[PDB]
Amino acid sequence: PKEMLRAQTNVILLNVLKQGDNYVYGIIKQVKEASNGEMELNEATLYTIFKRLEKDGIISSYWGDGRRKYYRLTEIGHENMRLAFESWSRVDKIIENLEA
Amino acid sequence: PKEMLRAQTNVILLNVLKQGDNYVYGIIKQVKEASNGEMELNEATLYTIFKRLEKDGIISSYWGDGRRKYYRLTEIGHENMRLAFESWSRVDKIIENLEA
Numbered sequence A, B: 001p002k003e004m005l006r007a008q009t010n011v012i013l014l015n016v017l018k019q020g021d022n023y024v025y026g027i028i029k030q031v032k033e034a035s036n037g038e039m040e041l042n043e044a045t046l047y048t049i050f051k052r053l054e055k056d057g058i059i060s061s062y063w064g065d066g067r068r069k070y071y072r073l074t075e076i077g078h079e080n081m082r083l084a085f086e087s088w089s090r091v092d093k094i095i096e097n098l099e100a
Ligand SMILES: c1cnc2c(c1)ccc1cccnc12
Pocket: A007, A011, A084, A088, B007, B011, B084, B088
């Protein structure tokens, strides 16, 4: 379901940036490693997602002295990531009680 | 973020139905209990979500002999729930490796 793989890739990328500013190929490398090789993200996919995140002010970009484009989680981005993690944490516990 | 509370309420409702066919007020009661009272879903919200799920063939409805409308997870619904749980389970582990 396209809308769901989009949400998953979004959460992964934001967690990569949570650990530190990074550039596209460094991100793709980290995600391939952490996924045991089963997630090879495409460059153009990152650009598509990063354009929406930059527009929404969740991330921003800057140049790093050949010159790579780096991305950073903004202050809003960090705060939104925290709200998401906490709200979905509640969802996780709700599902736990339903099953018991 | 409206799109995110929609996804959360969807996952909760599908997990309620995973445990057994149910009707709107029985669902609202279970979700209020499992959430320690902090999630009181509105009737009309369930109807909005169930209309989209029925249309997509994820759930179906039937009458239960005063007569309540019951909802059931379909066969497609169960299988989609399993794929989601497994894919998001991978996402969970990917994020775990990034943090280590
Ligand atoms: C099922 C399970 N987890 C999720 C979703 C659906 C959708 C979004 C999301 C965002 C962050 C963390 N988990 C989820």
